[PDB]
Design a protein around this ligand. Structure first.
Ligand SMILES: [Mg+2]
Ligand SMILES: [Mg+2]
Ligand SMILES: [Mg+2]
Ligand SMILES: [Mg+2]
Lengths: 793, 552, 99, 553
């Protein structure tokens, strides 16, 4: 269940908000495009006062669209329901051992007219061909998924469709806007028109392996694996004409297919020895990977029957399109590991790999990564020993490098696509390279061209990350107090990113580049206390606490200039934090005409507008004004896991949280302003009802205007709030039926349980609302509540 | 296991090393053309019509002032931020057009003229297309980067400057391309989408005339009016050139903005919007998707201004009411009116684009804003609702060609130059205004019936071929442009050229604000608003190589 | 000088469920087998196809529908059936003599 | 378990219990036109040009006499078998056309005239198309089954017979539809694919003209010429009717065979081939795929005969050479000639379909047969090679329309029915014949320069409006038809209407065997070969209901 959401205007308040905007700007509130007729006036004070509102039953002078007060969120929202079962059975003789598993998951989405289901089967096994010499084995997993997905941000589109629109029109049609109401389509209708768009997904993945042990402590083994998936679906365009939302009469079908095929192969030999106070592992091996995916599609318009039984490409009359391409890459890797220990006190481990990627030239295809780690089990030192309460104590220290080549498969290439323009867009932007050169107006095949999608980078290399760990593992009092403390320093080199190109470079100026280095470092702490009191209560606590500072080190000037890492192009980021932002700083709002003169010449500064401090200290605002206003790094993050058992009852919790965190978001632009958007008369948050006005001051929230003359939607601190929180991830209470009688029915474990997920969050007062760890969203995560059982045998 | 990583090749594309290949050259060339139909957005058409709501011709329209904020801010000259997306967009988009011309020229420069004999002729179209961008970029921004070394490697583009060239060198670099296209284009193009030698002359002209009105100080104010520049405009509007192409005026004014008459003698050069051409929904003119009227469901932008409407009034003798046109709203029963009104502005009680079954009204059906932006429809880009040339994609659009240079604009540029040269042939330059004015007097095919049906009084008369003061032939010339080119996005850009930007807008702001409350707090800042700011994000990425405009 | 590419695709999905009870008897000389049960089958299959013309590079690596420039066709439909079956069986003899 | 078997339903299909619905009605209609563009075959085109090689106008062409065997057997009238696959093919194809008209008509009848007032006008179009197929069947088979009860269930079709009606009763059933179309079609069709009133009238007349040349006997010979029939041919060829439609002769003869002039004022009714239209490659006129000349690679069928080339010769007064034309082959430098020849035959040394960049010659590029079948090229269905309207499918095709009724047919049919009426109206028919002849005399747009470049003497003159004998005016009418409709495949059907089939074709067989050695053992059989055999497969499947034709048992 969705348990909260951004509240939006009532159809009652939608008019209050407009009247207030109109009269704040000094034009007649009664000349609105949606009218909404008001009898207002003035108090003996000069100010305007709203006395009452009237809307005339239908939204037009024709009576096709009745007035409603729609809860567009409650309208496209269900209680979601999930059911799942899983049965699994294993058989272990010695000779070999097999396994088998069936299960099913089904999910009525929390969005209406949406669903999802999955069937799994797993079948694993091995065989001992020669009693301690040749094992052979296989793993296999088979999945089938079917879903109707919710459309691209509909909840977002439900929150800004005014409640004055109805769900159904006056015949019984799908309701929708009329006149000057915003060009937003009915979302409940969107969902219906979508309900038959269902994909079907099959995935096979597993491996076979041989393990051969030629003598004592040396064995070699190759495995081979594939992972094939396949998605097919048909999407239906049906014709709609709800209010001013027309399609005019478009029917189409698209039947699309996708195909992903990954295979992999390794071979690994290991030798290990054991000579009294001497232990060693050495391992050597290689592994190939290869993915080839690929997709295509068939499109046909115009169908004499509007049902998914008829809408197949064969039955289409109108025009048609065909789409599809494919891509792939291959990785190759060679590696070794060293393991050595003296007695059981001082341990050493070295690793070395050379990895190569399809994604690069060959000047930089391969790249070698080394690692060395070593510990010291101190409690095995005989001088220690006497303590005896101190159960264990190691002192670890690691240093290693690791690569990243997770970038586009065609990174290095200047890509030219023939894009003829066969494909949907919005408000233009075909970018289509096909033109009626002859001036014939068409009726035929136009001459086509090529077009650049990307510039190459034939000197692009791996992103190497250098990392250095040191920690202390401890266990105390008969292993009742266990934990760790470590510290990391991660330093990344030649960071891989896709870089939007400068403006005058024009079409497809983006390329994949390496742009410098970044620093990340901090501490971790783990502490568990597991005991059991006199009155028979097992308890096991295990919390965690962390902290880290991030620092951008070097950057190409162009890259630091264009604010991608990135100080908004007004200040470089080198020396600060990945994701730090420079902006204007809002010091409340002007509460009378005096504060406006008693403050720097600010372009659109009026009474009730937002007052931005001057940091020039030159008595004007301009654009140099700003400084750093946002920092993503938290003061520290923490987590604590609680297990309890008492009298067959079985209770577990998990708390996570973060404290001291800046958070920047756009949701206020829809909740504090009537005009901080690019489209007129969309529905707005519930809070701008308490904006500043003559009749209502000392409000933080600026007044209500029909246009953003003060540039309120500039990068400011208005949009940075406090994202401190403490989330209760999961709680789960269980009853386990006593084995003495769960065995009476040929069982062993028989337990029922109840559980919740995201039950509650604990948030700062300074936060506008919804989810602190998802500030960008107008709605929270959905709350799960589960009943279930386990059975044992 | 080094073969292994090299086996997979890119799929469904051409790699950069092979684009330079000869057989793809004409591909590049056509692709450079296409982007003029496919590179634009409803919020940034290559007609610049959005940045003409600055002038006295038109309003923004829409649901209201909030519907499309950043453009209401341009309509009143207030609120325009150097960070606004609609300005960063139009900058980038136009420069994207230049990529394609530059890529094509990179191939063309290498072709061997033995086998590819049209080598120079194609180079021209591309250089002709490259100018079409820089030209619009100049009018919008003035301080523009000059992109013309098509052999620039991409990383050298971070070192470019929009002050490498003095303002007049920039106009010059724009002209140099059209200069090349004149010297190398053929006299006739069988494929109407290609420019002819006539058009490159007429664009070489329009360039030298924007250059003539010098702004050689640090600000956007006139610093004289160059004669050597004006003298070139005369050279390349020579009617002996136009005749080699068959280019002239059409029998009737309405034949330019109509599909049945695409590509006649006045379509000197046009973007060739086509349909039923195998693209997703047609290569329609999607950019004007907001300018369609509210009867199609949306959206009612690009509403003609009353001050444009009233400037189609005429006196009894048949001439403009130069000094009294705006004092009284046009009243159909009594005033005399220029026919050209009924091809520019669809007004209530009259038919919408010649279909007498759709009568424009004052209701939710025709004004999306219940009046706040008026009840006038643009007509020149819209088409017959019942046309077999009009589809609905995201918004509505049609196959109606966009004419970048009409021939009426080849004559009036020639009359303006002769009037500002003042050298005895000012009497010649009135007989050019007569050619345009006389044509409009008879453009009453399709609207002859309006006299008896709606009570209209057409009177438009050519001026007497006598002696006129210079500053008076500059009054008659500014007016012919006003009633010839309404809603055709030329208006404001003229004013700035004339250097009376500040005066005419503010005075139009005042007289118009009693009629349209959005204009009530407007105000143009002299030597700041004649151009758009260079977009913040473009300055910022140069790492200090780009210069701002004066006043920002 | 025609160039084209068809991207075909077929799917065939059958599923089958049954239930079978079997009792069998053996009283010295006599021997029995009675079985009873039912079985449902369903097949749904389908296929679709994207055709495109004119390709500036005549190699399978270039010739995907996306890279095409001439005109396009789209093809496809589906079919399916189901069977239900009920059934019983008798078996009997005196000790491998008469059956 | 019953819900389980009802759950799957057909995919991408209307079931034949929703087809009668009103929203599909115009769908059935357009469907019924298309099969005229789509239901034919290179070896069975709905122009019937394959079965016009039997006349004196053309040859088969091809590699040789082995290429298209069953058609060389029709050319020489020796070897036709009641079981040849092509005769069966056309019988079934034309009856397929009648399927879509009768299915359209079934659904049209149940429409409410108040909810759908185009109801009668579409029944009209559908009945007009039904008669179009029936007419061509009669021309080809004579003893045909009349399938015009569109409310017949399908098993009622096993009891149908081709002798249910007498020959004159058959033709009246064909007439009876055309007769309906006239009374209910509108006078102008803004959608040029549908026939106007004038078209149905034209077609009503043509049918009564074949109906008037009676074969009331057991055999194929004439048994009289009915005046009541001929009085209907005059009636519906009235220029008052025609003028209501805006129909008439074109300025130049070549306009009727050029893509640039589709649906002009002579295209009284036509089949609307089209390109760039969503179909896989068509809707082209695929049926003429064999007739494209060797220069395109294939296949060189439908060649004009010398007996046709020479029939365009003229005397010094510009009249035809009725008694002496075929003696000496046409010599370009000496003899006068009808301009109509250079829009009908494309000859060696001359521009192929007006494109001077392709001069026909006598070589492997122009004759697939190394001269066996001659070096002439039919031009009325090919086009300029450089045409944007010509695509390569299986075979080569254009979107050049197919004119079923040209208007010159309206005039020459009217003249014939005046001359045979001999009610003293023969001078009005000579005025008709002149309209057609005067037009052609002047039809020299696109070949004007042929006088000084190739040496061509144009001379065509109208006849002087004096008194003429019936038997003479019937000669002047046949010759105008001969030159005016060359290679357009009404030829052989004219000779069978006139009952001259045996005498003319045998005479041609003799005169032409010295020029095309495939004609050397040819022999037409009187009272057998004027028509084709009812196909054996079709007789045999009727289980006794179909009678064969005379002379085939
Ligand atoms: Mg304005
Ligand atoms: Mg066009
Ligand atoms: Mg013959
Ligand atoms: Mg045609």
């Amino acid at each position: 269940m969705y348990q909260s959401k951004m509240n939006v205007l009532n159809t009652e308040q939608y008019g209050r908000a407009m009247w207030q905007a109109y009269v704040n700007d000094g034009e007649n509130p009664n000349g609105n495009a949606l009218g909404y007729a008001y009898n207002w006036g003035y108090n003996a004070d000069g100010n305007p006062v709203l006395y009452g509102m009237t809307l005339s039953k239908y939204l037009d002078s024709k009576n096709t669209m009745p007035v409603a007060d729609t809860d567009w969120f409650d309208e496209i929202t269900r209680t979601g329901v999930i059911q799942q079962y899983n049965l699994s059975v294993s058989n272990g003789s010695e000779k070999g051992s097999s396994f088998f598993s069936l299960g099913y998951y089904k999910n009525l989405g929390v969005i209406k007219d949406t669903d999802f289901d999955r069937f799994s089967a797993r079948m694993n096994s091995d065989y001992k061909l020669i009693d301690d010499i040749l094992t052979i084995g296989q793993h296999f997993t088979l999945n089938r998924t079917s879903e109707v997905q919710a459309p691209g941000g509909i909840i977002e589109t439900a929150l800004d469709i005014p409640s004055a629109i109805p769900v159904y029109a006056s015949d019984g049609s799908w309701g929708g806007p009329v006149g000057g109401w915003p060009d937003r389509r009915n979302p409940r209708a969107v969902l219906e028109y979508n309900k038959d768009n269902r994909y079907t997904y099959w995935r096979m993945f597993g491996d076979a392996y041989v393990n051969l042990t030629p003598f004592k402590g040396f064995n070699l083994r190759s495995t081979f694996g594939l992972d094939y998936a396949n998605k097919q679906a048909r999407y239906f365009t049906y014709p709609y004409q709800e209010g001013t939302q027309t399609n005019n009469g478009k029917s189409a079908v698209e039947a699309k297919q996708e195909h992903w095929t990954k295979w992999m192969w390794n071979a690994i030999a290991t030798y290990q020895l054991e000579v009294g106070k001497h232990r060693g592992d050495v391992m050597i091996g290689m592994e190939l990977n290869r993915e080839d995916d690929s997709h295509f599609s068939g499109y046909k318009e115009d169908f004499s029957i509007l049902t998914p039984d008829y809408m197949w490409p064969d039955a289409g009359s109108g025009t048609a399109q065909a789409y599809g391409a494919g891509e792939g890459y291959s990785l190759v890797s060679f590696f070794g590991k060293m393991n050595y220990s003296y007695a059981d006190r001082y341990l050493l481990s070295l690793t070395l790999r050379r990895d190569g990627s399809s994604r690069f030239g060959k000047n930089h295809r391969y790249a070698t990564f080394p690692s060395v780690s070593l510990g010291w089990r101190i409690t095995q030192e005989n001088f220690m020993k006497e303590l005896t309460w101190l159960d264990d104590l190691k002192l670890r220290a690691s240093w290693g490098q690791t690569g990243n080549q997770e970038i586009s498969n065609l990174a290095r290439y200047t890509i030219y696509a023939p894009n003829y323009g066969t494909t949907d867009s919005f408000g233009g932007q075909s970018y289509g390279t096909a033109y009626d050169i002859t001036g014939s107006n068409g009726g035929g095949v136009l001459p086509s061209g090529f077009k650049r999608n990307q510039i190459g980078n034939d000197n692009i290399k791996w992103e190497t990350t250098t990392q250095t760990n040191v920690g202390i593992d401890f266990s105390l009092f008969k292993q009742s107090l266990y934990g760790s403390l470590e510290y990391y320093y991660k330093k990344a080199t030649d960071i891989l990113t896709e870089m939007a190109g400068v403006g005058v470079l024009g079409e497809g100026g983006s390329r994949w580049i390496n742009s410098g280095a970044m620093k990340n470092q901090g501490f971790e702490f783990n502490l568990g206390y597991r005991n059991k009191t006199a009155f028979g209560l097992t308890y096991d606590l295990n919390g965690n606490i962390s902290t880290y500072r991030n620092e951008i080190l070097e950057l190409p000037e162009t890259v630091a200039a264009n604010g991608k890492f990135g100080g908004n192009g007004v200040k470089s980021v080198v020396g600060h934090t990945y994701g730090a932002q420079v902006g204007y700083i809002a010091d409340g709002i002007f509460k009378s005409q005096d504060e406006v003169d008693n403050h720097a010449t600010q372009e659109g500064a009026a009474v009730g507008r937002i007052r931005y401090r001057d940091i020039d200290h030159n008595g004007v605002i301009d654009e140099r004004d700003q400084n750093w206003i946002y920092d993503p790094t938290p003061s520290f993050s923490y987590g604590l896991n609680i297990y309890l058992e008492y009298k067959n009852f079985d209770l577990t919790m998990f708390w996570q949280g973060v404290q001291g965190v800046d958070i920047i978001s756009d949701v206020k632009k829809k909740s504090d302003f009537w005009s901080a958007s690019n489209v007129g008369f969309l529905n707005k948050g519930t809070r701008l009802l308490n904006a500043w006005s003559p009749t209502n001051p000392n409000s933080d929230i600026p007044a209500l205007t029909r246009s953003d003359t003060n540039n309120e939607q500039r990068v400011s601190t208005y949009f940075v709030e406090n994202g401190s929180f403490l989330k209760l991830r999961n709680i789960q209470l269980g009853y386990t039926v006593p084995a003495v009688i769960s065995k009476k029915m040929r069982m062993d474990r028989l337990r029922f349980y109840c559980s919740a997920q995201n039950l509650l969050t604990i948030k700062s007062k300074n936060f506008t609302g919804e989810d602190p760890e998802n500030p960008n969203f107008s709605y929270p995560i959905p709350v799960n509540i589960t009943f279930g059982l386990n059975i044992g045998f | 296991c080094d073969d292994f990583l090299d086996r997979q090749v890119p799929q469904g594309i051409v790699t950069g090393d092979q684009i330079a290949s000869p057989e793809y050259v004409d591909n590049l060339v056509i692709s450079a053309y296409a982007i003029w139909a496919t590179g634009d957005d409803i919020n940034s058409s290559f007609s610049l019509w959005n940045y003409d709501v600055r002038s006295d011709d038109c309003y923004k329209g829409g649901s209201g002032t909030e519907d499309g904020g950043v453009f209401n801010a341009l309509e009143i000259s207030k609120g325009i931020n150097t960070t606004d997306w609609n300005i960063n967009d139009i900058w980038k988009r136009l420069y994207q057009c230049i990529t394609r011309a530059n890529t094509a020229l990179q191939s063309l420069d290498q072709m061997d003229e033995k086998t590819y004999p049209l080598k120079n002729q194609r180079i021209a179209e591309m250089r002709f297309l490259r100018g079409h961008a820089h030209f619009m970029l100049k009018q919008l921004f003035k301080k523009i980067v000059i992109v013309n070394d098509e052999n620039m490697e991409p990383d050298a583009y971070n070192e470019l400057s929009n002050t490498t060239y003095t303002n007049d060198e920039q106009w010059q670099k724009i002209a140099d391309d059209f200069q090349f296209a004149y010297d190398n284009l053929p006299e006739v193009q069988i494929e109407k989408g290609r420019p002819a030698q006539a058009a490159a002359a007429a664009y070489l002209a329009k360039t030298y005339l924007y250059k003539a009105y010098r702004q050689d100080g640090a600000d956007n104010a006139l610093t004289g009016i160059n004669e050597e520049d004006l003298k070139q405009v005369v050279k390349y509007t020579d009617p002996l050139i136009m005749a080699k192409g068959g280019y002239g005026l059409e029998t009737d004014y309405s034949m330019n903005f109509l599909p049945q008459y695409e590509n006649g003698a006045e379509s000197v050069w046009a973007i060739q919007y086509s349909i039923n051409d195998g693209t997703y929904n047609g290569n329609l003119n999607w950019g004007m998707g907001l300018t369609t009227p509210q009867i199609l469901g949306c959206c009612d932008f690009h509403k003609p201004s009353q001050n444009l409407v009233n400037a189609f009034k005429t006196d009894s003798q048949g001439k403009p009411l130069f000094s009294t046109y705006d004092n009284e709203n046009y009243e159909v029963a009594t005033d005399n009116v220029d026919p050209r009104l009924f091809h520019t502005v669809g007004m209530p009680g009259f038919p919408y684009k010649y279909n007498e079954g759709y009568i424009i009204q004052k209701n939710d059906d025709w004004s999306r804003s219940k009046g706040l932006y008026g009840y006038y429809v643009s007509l020149k880009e819209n088409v017959d609702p019942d046309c077999d040339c009009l589809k609905k994609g995201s918004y509505w659009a049609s196959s109606l060609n966009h004419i970048v240079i009409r021939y009426a604009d080849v004559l009036l540029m020639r009359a303006e130059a002769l009037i500002q040269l003042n050298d005895g042939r000012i009497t010649d330059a009135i007989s050019l205004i007569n050619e345009v004015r006389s044509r409009a007097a008879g453009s009453t095919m399709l609207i002859f019936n309006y006299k008896e049906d709606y009570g209209v009084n057409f009177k438009v008369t050519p001026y007497d071929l006598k002696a006129y003061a210079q500053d008076e032939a500059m009054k008659m010339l500014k007016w012919e442009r006003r009633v010839e080119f309404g809603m055709e996005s030329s208006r404001f850009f003229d004013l700035v050229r004339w250097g009376e930007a500040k005066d005419v807008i503010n005075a139009y702001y005042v007289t118009e604000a009693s009629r349209c409350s959005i204009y009530k707090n407007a105000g143009f800042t002299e030597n700041k608003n004649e151009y758009l700011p260079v977009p913040f994000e473009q300055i910022s990425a140069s790492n200090g190589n780009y210069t701002q405009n004066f006043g920002w």
